[PDB]
Amino acid sequence: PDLKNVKSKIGSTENLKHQPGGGKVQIINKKLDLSNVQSKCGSKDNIK
Amino acid sequence: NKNSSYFVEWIPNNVKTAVCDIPPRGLKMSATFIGNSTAIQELFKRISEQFTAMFRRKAFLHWYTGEGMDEMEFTEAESNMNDLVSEYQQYQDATADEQGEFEEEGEEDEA
């Protein structure tokens, strides 16, 4: 006898393209703007 | 006589006497003093520095402006108390000797 060609069915041989692929993460951080800010009591200029 | 240093010298004989027949209930005899001294300078001296301590820094002042007063008025109350303490200190120990304008006419000069 002869079998010519035969192969397995179905598993890890059909998976070899798809890893799958991974990704990327990031924070999750900010600031605030302070540029407007002055004190809200204010007598010391009255020295004038 | 024993306290000449405690009277102002250009008001003479610094006493108002007066005598009632009738004592206070529960005292066999009493006297009332009403003395007018320069010494009261002390009251207005302390209060007007404490007042400049406040209005110089507008401290406590929002509560009163907040009822319709203005900063001119604090200035005028102060202006007057400072003027007043300066009047009592003008007369604190003011001379019976003449005050000011000490200038004169000279000598006749060859021509």
From Swiss-Prot, chain A:
Record-marked site positions (Not glycated): K4, K7, K17, K24, K40, K44, K48
Disease: In Alzheimer disease, the neuronal cytoskeleton in the brain is progressively disrupted and replaced by tangles of paired helical filaments (PHF) and straight filaments, mainly composed of hyperphosphorylated forms of TAU (PHF-TAU or AD P-TAU). O-GlcNAcylation is greatly reduced in Alzheimer disease brain cerebral cortex leading to an increase in TAU/MAPT phosphorylations.
Biological role: Promotes microtubule assembly and stability, and might be involved in the establishment and maintenance of neuronal polarity. The C-terminus binds axonal microtubules while the N-terminus binds neural plasma membrane components, suggesting that tau functions as a linker protein between both. Axonal polarity is predetermined by TAU/MAPT localization (in the neuronal cell) in the domain of the cell body defined by the centrosome. The short isoforms allow plasticity of the cytoskeleton whereas the longer isoforms may preferentially play a role in its stabilization.
Impact when changing N29K: In FTD1; with parkinsonism
Glycan attachment points: K9, K30, K31
Name of the protein this chain belongs to: Microtubule-associated protein tau
Modified residues (Deamidated asparagine): N29
Modified residues (N6-acetyllysine): K9, K31, K40, K48
Record localization: Cytoplasm, Cytosol; Cell membrane; Cytoplasm, Cytoskeleton; Cell projection, Axon
Tissue expr: Expressed in neurons. Isoform PNS-tau is expressed in the peripheral nervous system while the others are expressed in the central nervous system.
Posttranslational modification: Phosphorylation at serine and threonine residues in S-P or T-P motifs by proline-directed protein kinases (PDPK1, CDK1, CDK5, GSK3, MAPK) (only 2-3 sites per protein in interphase, seven-fold increase in mitosis, and in the form associated with paired helical filaments (PHF-tau)), and at serine residues in K-X-G-S motifs by MAP/microtubule affinity-regulating kinase (MARK1, MARK2, MARK3 or MARK4), causing detachment from microtubules, and their disassembly. Phosphorylation decreases with age.
Subunit structure and binding partners: Interacts with MARK1, MARK2, MARK3 and MARK4. Interacts with PSMC2 through SQSTM1. Interacts with SQSTM1 when polyubiquitinated. Interacts with FKBP4. Binds to CSNK1D. Interacts with SGK1. Interacts with PIN1. Interacts with LRRK2. Interacts with LRP1, leading to endocytosis; this interaction is reduced in the presence of LRPAP1/RAP.
Species for this entry: Homo sapiens (Human)
Tau/MAP repeat residue intervals: 1-24, 25-48
Cross-link (Glycyl lysine isopeptide (Lys-Gly) (interchain with G-Cter in ubiquitin)): K4, K9, K17, K31, K48
Highest taxon above the source species: Eukaryota
Swiss-Prot/TrEMBL domain comment: The tau/MAP repeat binds to tubulin. Type I isoforms contain 3 repeats while type II isoforms contain 4 repeats.
Swiss-Prot record, chain B:
Free-text domain note: The MREI motif is common among all beta-tubulin isoforms and may be critical for tubulin autoregulation.
Function according to Swiss-Prot or TrEMBL: Tubulin is the major constituent of microtubules, a cylinder consisting of laterally associated linear protofilaments composed of alpha- and beta-tubulin heterodimers. Microtubules grow by the addition of GTP-tubulin dimers to the microtubule end, where a stabilizing cap forms. Below the cap, tubulin dimers are in GDP-bound state, owing to GTPase activity of alpha-tubulin.
Positions of post-translational 5-glutamyl polyglutamate modification: E104
The record's account of how the chain is modified after translation: Some glutamate residues at the C-terminus are polyglycylated, resulting in polyglycine chains on the gamma-carboxyl group. Glycylation is mainly limited to tubulin incorporated into axonemes (cilia and flagella) whereas glutamylation is prevalent in neuronal cells, centrioles, axonemes, and the mitotic spindle. Both modifications can coexist on the same protein on adjacent residues, and lowering polyglycylation levels increases polyglutamylation, and reciprocally. Cilia and flagella glycylation is required for their stability and maintenance. Flagella glycylation controls sperm motility.
Organism: Sus scrofa (Pig)
Family indicated by similarity: Belongs to the tubulin family.
Intracellular or extracellular location(s): Cytoplasm, Cytoskeleton
Something else known: The highly acidic C-terminal region may bind cations such as calcium. Pig brain contains at least two forms of this protein.
Name by which UniProt lists this protein: Tubulin beta chain
Stretches the record annotates as Disordered: 90-111
